Design a protein around this motif. Structure first.
Motif, mmCIF file in Angstrom:
data_model
loop_
_atom_site.group_PDB
_atom_site.id
_atom_site.type_symbol
_atom_site.label_atom_id
_atom_site.label_comp_id
_atom_site.label_asym_id
_atom_site.label_seq_id
_atom_site.Cartn_x
_atom_site.Cartn_y
_atom_site.Cartn_z
ATOM 1 N N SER A 49 28.265 54.507 31.940
ATOM 2 C CA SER A 49 28.195 55.420 33.075
ATOM 3 C C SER A 49 29.262 55.027 34.093
ATOM 4 O O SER A 49 29.293 53.876 34.539
ATOM 5 N N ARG A 50 30.146 55.966 34.428
ATOM 6 C CA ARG A 50 31.228 55.738 35.381
ATOM 7 C C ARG A 50 31.932 54.387 35.158
ATOM 8 O O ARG A 50 31.978 53.559 36.065
ATOM 9 N N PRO A 51 32.475 54.156 33.955
ATOM 10 C CA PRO A 51 32.982 52.808 33.636
ATOM 11 C C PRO A 51 34.121 52.341 34.519
ATOM 12 O O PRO A 51 34.334 51.126 34.617
ATOM 13 N N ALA A 86 39.386 60.046 24.194
ATOM 14 C CA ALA A 86 40.725 60.217 24.749
ATOM 15 C C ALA A 86 41.805 59.875 23.729
ATOM 16 O O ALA A 86 41.683 58.914 22.963
ATOM 17 N N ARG A 87 42.875 60.673 23.719
ATOM 18 C CA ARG A 87 44.001 60.439 22.819
ATOM 19 C C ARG A 87 45.066 59.536 23.423
ATOM 20 O O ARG A 87 46.007 59.158 22.719
ATOM 21 N N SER A 88 44.945 59.193 24.702
ATOM 22 C CA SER A 88 45.967 58.417 25.388
ATOM 23 C C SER A 88 45.336 57.690 26.563
ATOM 24 O O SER A 88 44.232 58.023 27.011
ATOM 25 N N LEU A 89 46.078 56.708 27.080
ATOM 26 C CA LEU A 89 45.622 55.980 28.257
ATOM 27 C C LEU A 89 45.373 56.927 29.425
ATOM 28 O O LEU A 89 44.416 56.749 30.190
ATOM 29 N N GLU A 90 46.200 57.968 29.550
ATOM 30 C CA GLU A 90 46.173 58.800 30.749
ATOM 31 C C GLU A 90 44.874 59.587 30.848
ATOM 32 O O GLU A 90 44.367 59.827 31.952
ATOM 33 N N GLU A 91 44.304 59.974 29.709
ATOM 34 C CA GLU A 91 43.055 60.722 29.688
ATOM 35 C C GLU A 91 41.844 59.846 29.362
ATOM 36 O O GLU A 91 40.778 60.377 29.028
ATOM 37 N N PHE A 92 41.974 58.526 29.493
ATOM 38 C CA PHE A 92 40.930 57.575 29.106
ATOM 39 C C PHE A 92 39.871 57.522 30.204
ATOM 40 O O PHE A 92 40.134 57.022 31.296
ATOM 41 N N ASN A 93 38.676 58.046 29.952
ATOM 42 C CA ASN A 93 37.642 57.997 30.983
ATOM 43 C C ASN A 93 36.285 57.547 30.491
ATOM 44 O O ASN A 93 35.493 57.064 31.306
ATOM 45 N N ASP A 94 35.987 57.675 29.205
ATOM 46 C CA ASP A 94 34.665 57.391 28.677
ATOM 47 C C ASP A 94 34.761 56.320 27.598
ATOM 48 O O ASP A 94 35.726 56.283 26.829
ATOM 49 N N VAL A 95 33.771 55.435 27.568
ATOM 50 C CA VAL A 95 33.692 54.352 26.593
ATOM 51 C C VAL A 95 32.333 54.437 25.915
ATOM 52 O O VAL A 95 31.301 54.545 26.590
ATOM 53 N N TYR A 96 32.331 54.378 24.588
ATOM 54 C CA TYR A 96 31.100 54.325 23.812
ATOM 55 C C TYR A 96 31.079 53.035 23.013
ATOM 56 O O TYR A 96 32.069 52.698 22.352
ATOM 57 N N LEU A 307 43.845 45.714 39.885
ATOM 58 C CA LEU A 307 43.625 47.089 40.317
ATOM 59 C C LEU A 307 42.765 47.840 39.305
ATOM 60 O O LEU A 307 42.678 47.461 38.136
ATOM 61 N N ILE A 308 42.125 48.929 39.765
ATOM 62 C CA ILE A 308 41.244 49.691 38.878
ATOM 63 C C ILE A 308 41.990 50.100 37.617
ATOM 64 O O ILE A 308 41.491 49.935 36.499
ATOM 65 N N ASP A 309 43.206 50.625 37.775
ATOM 66 C CA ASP A 309 43.954 51.098 36.613
ATOM 67 C C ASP A 309 44.432 49.963 35.717
ATOM 68 O O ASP A 309 44.691 50.194 34.530
ATOM 69 N N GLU A 310 44.572 48.756 36.259
ATOM 70 C CA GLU A 310 44.911 47.611 35.424
ATOM 71 C C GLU A 310 43.733 47.195 34.542
ATOM 72 O O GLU A 310 43.898 47.008 33.333
ATOM 73 N N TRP A 311 42.536 47.046 35.125
ATOM 74 C CA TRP A 311 41.361 46.756 34.305
ATOM 75 C C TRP A 311 41.154 47.849 33.278
ATOM 76 O O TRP A 311 40.767 47.582 32.130
ATOM 77 N N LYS A 312 41.408 49.089 33.681
ATOM 78 C CA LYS A 312 41.246 50.225 32.787
ATOM 79 C C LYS A 312 42.210 50.152 31.611
ATOM 80 O O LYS A 312 41.830 50.453 30.474
ATOM 81 N N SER A 313 43.465 49.758 31.860
ATOM 82 C CA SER A 313 44.428 49.641 30.768
ATOM 83 C C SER A 313 44.071 48.494 29.829
ATOM 84 O O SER A 313 44.246 48.600 28.606
ATOM 85 N N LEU A 314 43.592 47.377 30.385
ATOM 86 C CA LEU A 314 43.187 46.255 29.550
ATOM 87 C C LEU A 314 42.015 46.645 28.665
ATOM 88 O O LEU A 314 41.960 46.274 27.486
ATOM 89 N N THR A 315 41.079 47.427 29.208
ATOM 90 C CA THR A 315 39.968 47.913 28.393
ATOM 91 C C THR A 315 40.477 48.812 27.271
ATOM 92 O O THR A 315 40.054 48.684 26.114
ATOM 93 N N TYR A 316 41.414 49.707 27.594
ATOM 94 C CA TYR A 316 41.984 50.593 26.584
ATOM 95 C C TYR A 316 42.616 49.794 25.454
ATOM 96 O O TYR A 316 42.431 50.110 24.272
ATOM 97 N N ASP A 317 43.368 48.749 25.806
ATOM 98 C CA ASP A 317 43.901 47.838 24.799
ATOM 99 C C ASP A 317 42.817 47.336 23.863
ATOM 100 O O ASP A 317 43.003 47.302 22.640
ATOM 101 N N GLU A 318 41.689 46.896 24.426
ATOM 102 C CA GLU A 318 40.643 46.308 23.598
ATOM 103 C C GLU A 318 39.972 47.347 22.698
ATOM 104 O O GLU A 318 39.484 46.997 21.616
#
Ligand SMILES: CC(=O)N1CCN(c2ccc(-c3nc(NCCc4ccccc4)c4ccc(N)cc4n3)cc2)CC1
Length: 327
Positions: A49-51, A86-96, A307-318
């Motif tokens: 929820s709101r990751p 999401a197909r890319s970092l830019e549209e990355f909003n939800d994690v399952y 920053l929020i977008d930095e943690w978000k990018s690191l999560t996307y990497d994982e």
């Protein structure tokens, strides 16, 4: 990239790979039971929820994914899958997150042989977690999943009833044996059917603990850095440590003995998970060749302020680097 399909469940839209079928809500982020068509097994699918809504959420999302990706042990929940539509970092909003669906928690669910096997498995999982320098910190019956033939897994790394007294008292430098305290509380409750320390708040909680274990001696007092904590201790009416054989009457004497080694006020003297596995109480389960340790776990991100977008990018990497486990 797999084919996704969307649906609304309760108040949320769920977008998941066609792999997962029969989504059925279990709790509210929010969890659904599903059927994993690749394996034929039932799974739990958790939609966070709101990751990434704040720094704190973003770092917490990253932390949870990193921990789940690390755990590879029969008595610890592990990550079967992680995905985003999401197909890319830019549209990355939800994690399952996808995990094994376990039958029920221990709060829902005893004979002494059942307590032996359940506490053995908790300690086996804790030896593994602790060997990675990870502390669970919130062990309690609802964080222990058990299936129908009594196989147990630790998940989800009142609350206060299982909490080590040094955490109540706000000590900054507590060690891994805060978790052993919790195991002691859990084991006592499985043997007696009663919460060991059902405190109404933090002061009541300490009062109940001290009534059983006794007020700290001078050996413990001389290690306490807080002047206010030392005075609080020395201000209470000294209570003698109770005889555990009296409290847990009729229990297996080896279980009483292990409880005596877990519910020690001084955490420098509390038994470790590895030591507890070798206790005579677990004689029929203990196998020192099948109680493995974990690979080292890189916890350095905990000390970082990003920053929020930095943690978000690191999560996307994982998410992208995840390798499913062998079937
Ligand atoms: C910020 C603030 O207000 N603080 C006040 C409390 N404080 C504090 C509290 C506890 C300890 C402390 N506790 C132990 N155990 C808790 C003992 C205890 C006794 C009675 C009731 C609750 C806990 C220890 C055990 C071993 C050890 N080597 C060192 C230990 N050290 C240290 C500092 C410092 C932070």
């Amino acid at each position: 990239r797999p084919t996704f399909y969307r649906q609304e469940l309760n108040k949320t839209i769920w977008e998941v790979p066609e792999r997962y079928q029969n989504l059925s809500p279990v709790g509210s982020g929010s969890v659904c039971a599903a059927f994993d068509t690749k394996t034929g097994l039932r799974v739990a699918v958790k939609k966070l929820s709101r990751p990434f809504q704040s720094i704190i959420h973003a770092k917490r999302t990253y932390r949870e994914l990193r921990l789940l990706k690390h755990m590879k042990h029969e008595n610890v929940i592990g990550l079967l899958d992680v995905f985003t539509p999401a197909r890319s970092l830019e549209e990355f909003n939800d994690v399952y997150l996808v995990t094994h669906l376990m039958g029920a928690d221990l709060n829902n669910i005893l004979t002494d042989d059942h307590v032996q096997f359940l506490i053995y498995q908790i300690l086996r999982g804790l030896k593994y977690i602790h060997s990675a320098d990870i502390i669970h910190r919130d062990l309690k019956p609802s964080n222990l999943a058990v299936n129908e033939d009594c196989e147990l897994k630790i998940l989800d790394f009142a609350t206060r009833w299982y909490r080590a007294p040094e955490i109540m008292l706000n000590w900054m430098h507590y060690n891994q044996t805060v978790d052993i305290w919790s195991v002691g509380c859990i084991m006592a409750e499985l043997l007696t059917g009663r919460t060991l320390f059902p405190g109404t708040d933090h002061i009541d909680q300490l009062k109940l603990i001290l009534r059983l274990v006794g007020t700290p001696g001078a050996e413990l007092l001389k290690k306490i850095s807080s002047e206010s904590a030392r005075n609080y201790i020395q201000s209470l009416t000294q209570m003698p440590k109770m005889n555990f054989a009296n409290v847990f009457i009729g229990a297996n004497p080896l279980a009483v003995d292990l409880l005596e080694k877990m519910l020690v006020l001084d955490s420098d003297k509390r038994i470790t998970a590895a030591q507890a596995l070798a206790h005579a109480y677990f004689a029929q389960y203990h196998d020192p060749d099948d109680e493995p340790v974990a690979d080292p776990y890189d916890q350095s991100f905990e000390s970082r302020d990003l920053l929020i977008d930095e943690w978000k990018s690191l999560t996307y990497d994982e998410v992208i680097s995840f390798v499913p486990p062998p079937l």
